[PDB]
Design a protein around this nucleic acid. Structure first.
Length: 137
RNA sequence: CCGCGGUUCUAUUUUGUUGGUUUUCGGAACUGAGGCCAUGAUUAAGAGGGACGGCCGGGGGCAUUCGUAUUGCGCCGCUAGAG
């Protein structure tokens, strides 16, 4: 009770941290072992007010620390991690804020379980946006 | 190729007293049974066609099935952002 379980010292509680680290934004989302129930979600867009640094490591680590103190407020100790890119037909790589948010969570008194990639990879996608001539800049 | 059967006609004869001539008279018309030919098919193209045997191949047509992705929908969670 009291915003946490009654688990003894012998066993620790495992959360799940979805790090949707794309370009232009990074999501850190802590949930239970099914993901059905959520504890906290903080993103760079709601942490920086410059509209450009939504994917910056500066805003990403601040998001990670905020969900970290909230997780400790709920007594969450261990944390399996699911890293996720944009996926689909678009980019399949994590953005800049993945490593900063990951490092911030470790250094904020949290424990780390297993990191796995849940990036959506199509067998073969639909027509990707941009035309056949690419994005001529 | 060689002889022996097997048809229709025809240059000439002179069986000089006319007549009848035998003129098969000579040769050419159609053919059956033969003999002989060393009897008679160039080779099978590092040309081609076809067959046969085991494969081989995102070759093609039809039918069936699997995969996540994307988009949309319905609940649940949570915050004011998301893009």
């Amino acid at each position: 009770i009291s915003l946490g379980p009654q688990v003894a010292e012998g066993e620790n509680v495992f959360g799940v941290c979805h790090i949707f680290a794309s370009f232009n934004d990074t999501f850190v989302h802590v949930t239970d072992l099914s993901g059905k129930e959520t504890i906290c979600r903080v993103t760079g867009g709601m942490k920086v007010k410059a509209d450009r640094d939504e994917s910056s490591p500066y805003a990403a680590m601040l998001a990670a620390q905020d969900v970290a103190q909230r997780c400790k407020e709920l007594g969450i100790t261990a944390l399996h991690i699911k890293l996720r890119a944009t996926g689909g037909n678009r980019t399949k790589t994590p953005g800049p804020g993945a490593q900063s948010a990951l490092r911030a969570l470790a250094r904020s008194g949290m424990k780390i379980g297993r990191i796995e990639d849940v990036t959506p990879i199509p067998s073969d996608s639909t027509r990707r946006k941009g035309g056949r001539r690419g994005r001529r800049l």
